[model samples]
Structures are given as structure tokens and as C-alpha cells.
Target: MAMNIKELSLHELCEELKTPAWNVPLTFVGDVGGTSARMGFVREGKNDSVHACVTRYSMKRKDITELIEFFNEIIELMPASVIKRVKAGVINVPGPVTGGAVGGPFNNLKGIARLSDYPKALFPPGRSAILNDLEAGGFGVLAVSDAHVFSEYFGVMWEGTQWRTCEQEPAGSVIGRGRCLVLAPGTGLGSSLIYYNPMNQQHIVVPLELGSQTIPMRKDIDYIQTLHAELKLLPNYENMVSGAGLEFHYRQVVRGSRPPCSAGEIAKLASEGDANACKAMKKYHEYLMRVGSEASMALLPLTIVLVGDNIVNNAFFYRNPQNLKEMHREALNHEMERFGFQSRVTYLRQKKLLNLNLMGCYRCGLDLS
Candidate 1:
């Protein structure tokens, strides 16, 4: 069995892969997220065999210099023989990317202006590509779909029912051909749409900045009003559906009765039946599903893939006996009926593959080559 390299340390990474020389083309791939960065190499045509030595480094410094340093450090750890085979590279950042340049205000990376500024040591000239993280995730979904692994690693999460894997559905029916929506909430909320054209076998990933759109005012929910007033920040969906959003809502729910807690800590509290924590988590899921519902209505995608650290880490909110997941399903169904825009769609949650974005980078790297 192969060891999981998702959390390997630098030294361990090098040790596991050994100093092997290769004749095949290699592409450098990196996924720079809001909290950390995962970097590694992949063989030209073997995305399934993504380097078992891929290592994740924390994003302690929120600047371009630190990012470059990270790239240099990882490159230094690779064996000379492997580095010699490098042909192309691809990096996906947590922001809008246009013409190989990062546009808009990304979460914490302050000085990263464009892909051209990346040191040649990473990838020479036009041998590299930059993409938005969620766009990469959309490609990852395509990879998984192409590999037919959805049944093994993903399932529908709705209606307080047992998760039904894609295998249970008819062939090509689960993630039917056409548009698929990818929604993820982590350090921030990100969304992408993947359009698969079976005719040409081409996949187009469209990155969406839906997080910046203001959330609707729900006068029926008093806490929603109070939290928004107290936070005094933008009323965007990311503000309430992301990792920080969870903590923000938790703080408001407690009303200073307890000190601040991380999103993970808040999740633990919710599992332990803490009232305030549960309240915050409940609201969090409600808003998340609301966004999903709205996006679904607009996109009419064949499937909706929900992936990211936040969703994976806090899945209990959807799986617990509290029926929150079912509540959202009922709400969506009611709205669809009221509007007479009924369309069949599958809601999927990635079960085991946490390296979706990394795999996406590998795919883009291959394309660059």
C-alpha cells in the first residue's frame, strides 16, 4: 500500500521517494490555499501516480516573497535527477486568475502580482500556467469523473438519508454530461462550474466570485441580523459560510460568555451538544445550503460537488441526527415546486480525496507541457 503524502514533512518526503532518476517528463504542481500550500511533481501522463512525496507547507507569511521561498525550499528537497526532468509547472492560487495574472484581492497573499514574476527556477517562460484554486478543483472533479472513482470517494448528502454512491446510479447518470457546480468553503468560500462536452471530450472550468456577493437579509432570523450588525463587515456569503465565518457566528452566539475558538474547536463543541455551538453551526449550514440552492437555481447543473477542508472537517453538521441536511433539502424542493423549475440534480460530497486541488494542479501542469 502506498503511504498518503498529503501531510508529509520535507525530510520524510525526500526519504520516501528516494533519489530516483526518470526518463519521463515531469511537471511541477502547487496548490496555494488560504491556510497552506501543497507542492510536488507529477509525471507527464500519470496524474494517478501523483508524486508520493508531495509535501504541505504552512502559509505563515502572507506575501509573495514567502511563496517564492516555499517554491525554492521544495525544489531544493527534490533529487537532482528528478529536477532535470521537469518540463512545465502549474500553480493555483485562491483568487481570480486572468492571462496568468492574479486579479482581485486574494485572501492573504499580498505581493503575488502575476505568473510572469515567478522565478524561472520554477518553470521557464511559457511552460507554466496559473489558475484560480476553485477552477483547479473543477478540473479535479473532471479527473475523478474520468477515472470513474466517484462511487468510491463521493456520495449524495441530502434528506437525512444514507449516502448513495455514484455507483448505485446508472452509468453516466450520477454526474451526467454537461455542467457541474463545484462549491467549497474553507479559509474562504469558493465556487467553480465545470462544463464537460462529451462530443469533444473537453472540460471548461469557470471560476466564480460568488462569495463576494452580498447575502440576502433574512429578517426572520434575529441572530442573522445581530451577527451582521456586530461583525460590521461586508454582508457577503463568504463572511458567514467560511472558516472565519463559523468563528464569527460562534462568538456572536455566545455573546462573550466564552472566549473565542477556532472553527475546529467550535465543531467539537457542536458535537458535544453545546447549545451555542450548535446554534452557530446550524446557521452556518443554513447559509451554506442557501448559497448552494441559489447557485443551483441559476446554473441548473447536473450535479453539485461540495468539497474543501471546512466541509470535510465539519461534516457532522450535515450527518448528525439534528436533520439540518434534510431541512435544507425540503426547503430546496419546496422552492423548486413553487417556481415550477423542477430539475433532477445530485448533491455530492467528496468522501476521501482531500487533494482535489493538488490533482487539478497536476492536470494543468500536464496541459502546459
Candidate 2:
């Protein structure tokens, strides 16, 4: 039922799908995360149509059986003609996948154990692939061609004390080809590196286990020590950069002056100019930028794209030109005085919440088809 999807690179997988027996016109695409799951069908040459048919499910108490039931429900809704053409399914989960199966228990979603058999259960068993959620996000970035989908920050130079934007030209540039880094902070921190060449349509997505990586204790940051004491858990990027982590930081910032609040509520308060909320967001941004800088130093990617519920909800911190400039300045200091490193910081900008993960599943399905 399950195939060794990772044995072949995505480009090679696409080539293999070109064979007459493997070729199909429709694919089942699913993006499963910690809190929710989105599933849909992607028709060949009709990528734009994916968003219209997507169905969302809350993953609170649901398990594999419920998931399969949902899958069958969607399949039943498909027209006979379309259903006949469906031959493949690709589901992206928020955990490592190996040999088309989840490598371990998911960080957030604890109910579901394995997904390798999902494709056989959902599709006609022609071709099935599994991907890490962030890996799929990288493919989503590669699939999107519009520059307007991103809020670009560029042309900033560090001047000893701070970073300043160049007065001549400050408009963000369009998304270009080559290597790019994607940092997504949601229920957990997710990261991936993508190298894409539009010329030949060859690409690679390297998912990184950034969330679980331990965070070094910094004596200068009091909250880092305090939060670690409070939670009694090892400090990691996910502990500081994710939704629960944001709440922890906010709680530390308030120091019992106020009651606990959700990360979404904290973002709203920050937008309202709450002092404590602002302080928490500022710290979150610092750690996020630090992780980005460290990753950049190691990978030296051409661009850095920030996506996820945490980043998108707290737009005030990332979208603000002044705040972005400061974040970039700090990153430059860590990046060996590299100029324009600030310019590489890009944010996904969209009106409706665009499910890049789901879109990524669709994009990968197209290739498999």
C-alpha cells in the first residue's frame, strides 16, 4: 500500500509518474497539521481550482478511522468522471516521514500514529507519497510565482547602532529562483530549505528539525531562565517561537500582573499597544530572527520566507518597516556584518488565510500525476 516516496527526489518522482501506467489526471491532496487537517482534490492543469474544494477538519479527538471516513466522504462527492481519473494521493503531516510512513509520534497531533496506508485507503493505489508539513510548505513557496503574495523587506544597511532602509528604493522585489529558507511557527516551529530553478523546474525541499533543537540558556535574558524554571522542560526553539511558547513568554513578561492569555489574544493586545504584549512580541521576534540568522549562516540561502500562524497573526511585529529593520539589523550583526541580509526577510502576505500546506500538497500531487 505504501511506497518509498522519499527514495526518489521529487524531480525524479515526477519523471517516474510520466510513464503511461502511472499517469493520471486527478490527485487527492491532504495537509494534516497539529490542530487541523485540510483535504481536497487537485486536477491536472487546474491548480487554481484547489482552494475551492478544500474541506477542513478539526483534529482534536479524531483518529485514523475518522480521517479515512472523511477521505471517503470527499471521494464520494467527486463526479464519476473525476473519480475514475484519480490515481494518486499525497498527505503532508507535521512529523518526519520515512518509506511513506510517519517516522514518530507527531509533536502536536497525538491521536494519529501512522499515515503510510492513507494513500491506498484514499486513492486507487496508483501512487502515494507522504511529506513533512514544512517540507510541503517549501513546495508551496516554490509553486507560487506571484511576488505580491509576499511582503518583501529589503535595502536595509546596518549603521553601527541600528539598521536603516535605503531611501532610494524600498519596494520589495518579486520572488526569484534559487535557494530559499522557510520558517514557520505555529503550534510548533517548522522549517524547510528549498532550492528551485524555474528554468528546468527542478527543485528540492530539505526539512529541518529546528523546533526540537535545544535553545542555549542566555544569562542576559531573564525570561529564558525564568520560563525554563516555570515549565520544567528543556528550552527549545518551539518553546519560545511557537503558539504555546508565545503564551509562555507573554506570561513571563507580565509576571502575574495579569491573567494568562492565548497567543492570538496576545497578538491582538500587542496591536492595541499593550506594553507587556509589545515586550513579549519583541522578545519573540528576537529569538525568531536569531534562529533565522543561525540557519542562514549554515545554509546561506538566497531568501528567507516566514510563514505560519504565529508569524501571520502577529503581523505588527514582522510587517512593520521599523520593526523589520531592527530584526534585520540584529541578524546582520550575527551574520558577520553582511549587508542586505535584512532584505532577504520576506513575509507571506495574503487577504484570506491561504493554506500554503494544502496548496503544497496539491502542487506535489500535480507532479505525481
Candidate 3:
């Protein structure tokens, strides 16, 4: 059976490894966000292979301390010798990191910011470090083997007028070797620009809070007006491109004709021939393309990895059988040129997404600390 000691401290793992007859074999890692938290530990499985045991908890009723306390309780159950050896930890947070403090409007939850003293409370002073969630995700992209990444040539072929998958790129091939950009759309939209240093073999992550920008949405008169009436402002980038944003469009499309629930439902209704739902889905797709084009053009990344629940599960929020190019390729590319989005690098559109924030935390705990 696998161990669920994900909250195990680094010192403990180090100590166990130092011991003559080490029995503890797992290392803990965490990814904490405003809406939820995940704690997990990696251990050798039945075949001497290693895997992570993770547990997720909702943040609605729990605070950081409570999450850590719960984690510590689990760690305490380990053999005392193994437990005492654990010291430092690496955590990924949703907000900006300043001298190990996490602050600002983090995620879409209420009263979840200003985590200045969380590091001290969790471990020995200076034993733990906090990283921005998106930055960590950038690192995660670099941490995996080339086999895990797609190649620059990886994409669907352009048929007569639409885009469709032709063939898969070979595995274990190089993706973009230079700069890369990461865009994630989950509860919120996250952006990061990464640079790779071949000499030092280091990847630099430049996180962008693009969600905070006031990105204008075109052709959705009813939605914008209704949202302004309720929120007292026009839609922001995050609200326009995230899961929550899809709901805003759904509200406008339904307009009391039907009850709104999730982003998935909007796409389903559109496929089934609902005009309002179609409009909402198409509008969201358009906004996504605009933002993506703008960012890709500005960054000129060799490869653009679009991630998160929204893009990965459904390509650009569209269900299977219909994709970005199929829906509107000429329009997206034309807009990119019009909006000053130049392509200096190859574009790698990926449908397989990862929990980059979580993988990033694991990468830090394993390699950095």
C-alpha cells in the first residue's frame, strides 16, 4: 500500500536517508490555493516504482493553518525517527511571493490572502519557501522529461479550410528549445513566460497577473451590461477567460430563459442547437483567441503550452469533434496579425494539461530544497 504522508517535512526524509537502516521512503509536497489545497507524498510502490499519494481539501471552511495542522497530524503518525528528521518544505501559492510572504487577491476565494507568517508557523524559520503558482508551473514544464513534452512540429494539419490532426510527433523529441509561454485557465487565468539558460541549465519563470487586466469583450452587449449592473464594472480578463467567465456569458445567453450552472453545460447546449449558448461559447472562444494571440505575439514564445481544466479537458472550451482551427482559424490568425501578434517562434498547441501548480510544488520540494 502507498503512504499518505505528503505533509512529511524535508528534514525527516533527509534524516531517514542518512540512517543506516532507513525505512521511511516517501517525500511530501503541497500545492495550496485560495479555493482548495492538495498535500501528497511520493513513495516506492509494489514494483519498486515510486508514486505520489495525494489528498484534496476544500478551502471554504478551512484556513492555511488548519490545512497544515491536518497535514502535520498525518506526518506525526509516521515513525518518530522518520518524523523528527523532517525539517523544511516547499509550497506553491496563488498570490505573489515577497520574502516568503504570499499576498494579494489570490484565486477566487474570500479572505485568503496575506499569508506573511505561514512559513514560520509550518517549519523552522528559513526552512521553507513559497513560490508563485504560475512560476512553479513554468518550472514544472521544464522539470519533466522531453518525452513528457510535445515537439514544435506537434499540431493538427491545415486541411482545405480547417485544422485537423494528421499525425503525432515522435516521443522523446525536443519541444521549443528557447523561450516558452504557459497559459492556464482554471478557476482563473494564469500566464507565465519562461527562459531557458543552456549554460547553467536553469529555467527562469516570469509570472504575469494577466487576469487583473481589464480586457474588453466585443459583441456581447447584453452580458457586459448585465455584469456591470451587478459587479459595478465591466468584465476583467480573469472574469472574461476563466470558468467563472463562461458562466457570465451563459447568464447573458440564457437571459432568464434557462437556469445556468457550469461551463460544460454551455458547450453542450450549443452543440444541441441553442442560439444563446452558441453565442456565449463562441464569444468566449473569441476572447480566448484574442488574449492568446496578444500574449503569444508579445512574448514570441517558441512554444505556447495552453493548460488548465478549461483548455485541457476541452480544447479552448469547445467539446470534442470541434477545435480552435475548425471553429475559426483564419479569423484568429488574422486578428493576431491585426493586433500586432507576430510569431517569431513555433507554436505547440497541447490538449494534455497538468496540475502545473502541484507538479511545480513537487519539483521544488524534490530538486530545490
TM-scores for all candidates: the values are 0.76, 0.73, 0.68
Q: Residue 106 deviation, candidate 3, in Å?
A: 5.3
* Best of the two (1, 3) by TM-score: 1
Clash count of each predicted structure: 0, 0, 6
lDDT of 3 at 97: 73
Q: Is candidate 1 or candidate 2 better by TM-score?
A: 1
lDDT of 3: 0.56
Ranking by TM-score: 1, 2, 3
Candidate 1: where is the Cα deviation over 4 Å? 1-22, 33-36, 44-49, 55-62, 66-84, 102-107, 119-127, 159-176, 198-200, 217-224, 231-234, 247-262, 321-325, 330-334, 339-343
Q: After the best TM-score superposition of candidate 1, give how far the Cα of residue 256 lies from its true spot, in angstroms.
A: 8.2
Per-residue lDDT of candidate 2, residues 99-134 (tens digit): 655544665555453554453535555467778878
RMSD of each: 4.7, 8.7, 6.7
Ranking by lDDT: 1, 2, 3
Which sections of candidate 2 miss by over 4 Å?
Answer: 1-24, 33-36, 44-52, 56-61, 72-80, 101-104, 107-126, 146-174, 197-201, 217-223, 255-260, 338-352
Candidate 2 collision pairs: none
Model 3 superposed RMSD (Cα)? 6.7
